[model samples]
Target: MQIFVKTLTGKTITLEVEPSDTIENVKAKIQDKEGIPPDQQRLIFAGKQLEDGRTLSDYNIQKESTLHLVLR
Candidate 1:
């Protein structure tokens, strides 16, 4: 599935990740792209904090869906 992420810096990125990708994995990808650290990244999905081991499928993320990421 494809996911869209917006960084705290206002940069938007799209990734084609597997449904099995964990929230932590996603965070890592975003950090790589945005040059941020995992500890400094905060991700929210469906108005809740994304649990570390939760997969994108667990959140029912769809193609073109957007997820928010805040950098601390």
Candidate 2:
């Protein structure tokens, strides 16, 4: 699946991911490029907080879904 992420800093990151990918997996990428640790990051979509233990498919994250990334 392809998705979009909007950073708090007004940046956009396009990602190619699987529906089975964990929130933690996406956080890892954020940590790698955004300099924010996983624990310090919050991901939200469809007005719900994305849990690190859950996969994107768990929340019905559709193709082209856009998530908001906040740094703590």
Candidate 3:
């Protein structure tokens, strides 16, 4: 599955992932691609904050879903 992550500036990062991937795994992917650390990243989908231990399937995040990424 492929998901989209949008930054504050509206730049979209398309991540190739699987439904079984955890949110923490996703963050590590982002960190590899963009240099933002996992601890400093927040992921939001469907107006809800995503938990690191939860899988994408747990959140019902399907292919092409868009997630908002915030760095703190």
- Output the number of the TM-score-best candidate: 3
Q: Give the per-residue lDDT of model 2 (tens digit) for 1-72.
A: 989888887798888889999999998977777777888889999989999999999999989999998654
Sorted by TM-score (best first), the order is 3, 2, 1
Stretches off by above 4 angstroms in model 3 are: none
* TM-scores, one per candidate: 0.87, 0.89, 0.93
Clashes of each: 0, 0, 0
Q: Give the TM-score of candidate 2.
A: 0.89
Error of 1 at 7 (Å): 0.9
**Which digits, one per residue and each the tens of the lDDT, describe model 1 over residues 1-72?**
888998876678888799899988998898778787888778887787888899988988878888888544
Higher TM-score: candidate 1 or 2? 2
| Pairs that collide, model 1 | none
How far out, in Å, is residue 22 in model 1? 0.2
Off by over 4 Å in 1: none
| Candidate 3 weakest lDDT stretch, 10 residues | 5-14
C-alpha positional error of residue 57 in candidate 3 after TM-score superposition, expressed in Å: 0.5
